[PDB]
Design a protein around this ligand. Structure first.
Ligand SMILES: *[C@@H]1O[C@H](CO)[C@@H](O)[C@H](O)[C@H]1NC(C)=O
Ligand SMILES: *[C@@H]1O[C@H](CO)[C@@H](O)[C@H](O)[C@H]1NC(C)=O
Ligand SMILES: *[C@@H]1O[C@H](CO)[C@@H](O)[C@H](O)[C@H]1NC(C)=O
Length: 401
């Protein structure tokens, strides 16, 4: 009951229990949402030309036998997502020497998938998506040393209590363009952990373009330790959004805003963009950012910021883009932006600005001189006029009668 148009065969949701007879010339086959219970060598022995195979969400318990993919040397993308309780025989992916993307989201997989030989045949793999599985420890087997182009790994929504040097030993040498460690908790990596000395540097001799550690809490004391531990790792862009424990509270005394020591390990990482948006930061302290010496973009949007110290931004001479919107700022100190000499864009909107004079004098004049840089429009609380338009009267002694 498939729809075969040209090189494409769409067999989505047709109540199939086996791979159906398709024409031998097809290169794109989608068999998602069916009742196929097992895939073996005879499953694709007539579809030898496939480039894109998709077999998502079968009825639960799909088994993939040894040599199912023998001689699909043309297959580049294989998607096996949402297959509850997936069973892989350990030579399941034999033959796939040219495969570049494998996605296995939500298949109840655990660490064995990365530590056994399941992925050994995949010498060309660039992109491995393993979201929302049950991986507790990221422990890649030794063949990963030889996957020259493995560069994208997404582990979002696994619960991984820690990441350590000896865990990631076979990722040493890699350059990851996207190492996505989002929403994995890193529960054990905190103030109270005795395992820090032994953990070392999970990223020893590894480089990263985008390191996504969002949604993992990152209380100030955890960030410090974590970035000391990975001190010196080349990272181009650092995502720490939804660091739900970052910032201070009158409620729990322990908790503090990040300081000039917090991000010191990132000193020589060459970070170009840093996202700390959507967190709980209440104050920007002296020199908190003074270690990102190559920083070009910084977002602190949607925190709870209501205090910016003199020198919050010391050492950000290369910064092009700064976002401070949607906080609780009534004011900023005089001259706070003066040494941001590469500033191209700034966001200051959705803050309750107090436009009393002479408090608002510096920000108003600045926002006017730099109106081409302001994205959106910071407004005065109460009146709702733009802060750009406020001309403060001058103090009487400066213009004597
Ligand atoms: C493969 O699977 C089909 C049914 O799914 C079965 O009839 C056939 O004998 C199997 N062949 C091998 C080699 O496992
Ligand atoms: C499948 O292939 C592997 C790896 O080479 C082999 O050791 C294993 O015994 C095979 N398993 C089965 C169940 O046939
Ligand atoms: C890892 O170490 C080697 C020296 O052993 C070095 O030359 C190389 O650039 C490093 N690789 C990465 C990706 O940092």
């Amino acid at each position: 009951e498939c729809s075969v148009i040209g090189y494409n065969a769409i067999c989505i949701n047709r109540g199939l229990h086996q791979v159906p007879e398709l024409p031998a010339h097809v290169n794109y086959v989608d068999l998602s949402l069916n009742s196929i219970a097992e895939l073996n060598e005879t499953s694709f022995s007539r579809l030898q030309d496939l480039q894109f195979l998709k077999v998502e969400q079968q009825t639960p318990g799909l088994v993939i036998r040894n040599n199912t993919f023998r001689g699909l040397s043309s297959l580049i993308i294989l998607k096996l997502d949402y297959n509850q309780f997936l069973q892989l025989e350990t030579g399941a992916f034999n033959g796939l020497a040219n495969l570049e993307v494998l996605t296995l989201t939500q298949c109840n997989l655990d660490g064995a998938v990365l530590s056994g030989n399941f992925f050994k045949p995949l010498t060309s793999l660039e992109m491995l998506v393993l979201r929302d599985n049950n991986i507790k420890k990221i422990q890649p087997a030794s063949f990963f040393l030889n996957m020259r182009r493995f560069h994208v790994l997404d582990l979002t929504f696994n619960k991984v209590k820690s990441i350590c040097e000896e865990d990631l030993l076979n990722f040493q040498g890699k350059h990851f363009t996207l190492l996505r460690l989002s929403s994995i908790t890193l529960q054990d990596m905190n103030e109270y952990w005795l395992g820090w000395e032994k953990c070392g540097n999970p990223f020893k001799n590894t480089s990263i373009t985008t390191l996504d550690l969002s949604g993992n809490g990152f209380k100030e004391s955890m960030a410090k330790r974590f970035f000391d531990a990975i001190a010196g790792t080349k990272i181009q862009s650092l995502i720490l959004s939804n660091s739900y424990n970052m910032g201070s509270s009158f409620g729990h005394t322990n908790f503090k805003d990040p300081d000039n020591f917090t991000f010191k390990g990132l000193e020589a990482s060459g970070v170009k963009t840093c996202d700390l948006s959507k967190s709980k930061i209440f104050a920007l302290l002296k020199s908190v950012f003074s270690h990102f010496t190559d920083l070009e973009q910084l977002t602190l949007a949607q925190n709870e910021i209501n205090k910016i110290d003199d020198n919050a931004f010391w050492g950000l001479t290369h910064l092009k883009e700064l976002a401070l919107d949607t906080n609780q700022l009534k004011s900023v100190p005089d001259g706070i932006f003066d040494r941001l000499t590469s500033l191209q864009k700034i966001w200051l909107h959705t803050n309750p600005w107090d436009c009393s004079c002479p408090r608002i004098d510096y920000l108003s004049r600045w926002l006017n001189k730099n109106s081409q840089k302001e994205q959106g429009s910071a407004k005065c609380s109460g009146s709702g006029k733009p802060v750009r338009s406020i001309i403060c009267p001058t103090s009487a002694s400066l213009v004597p009668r």
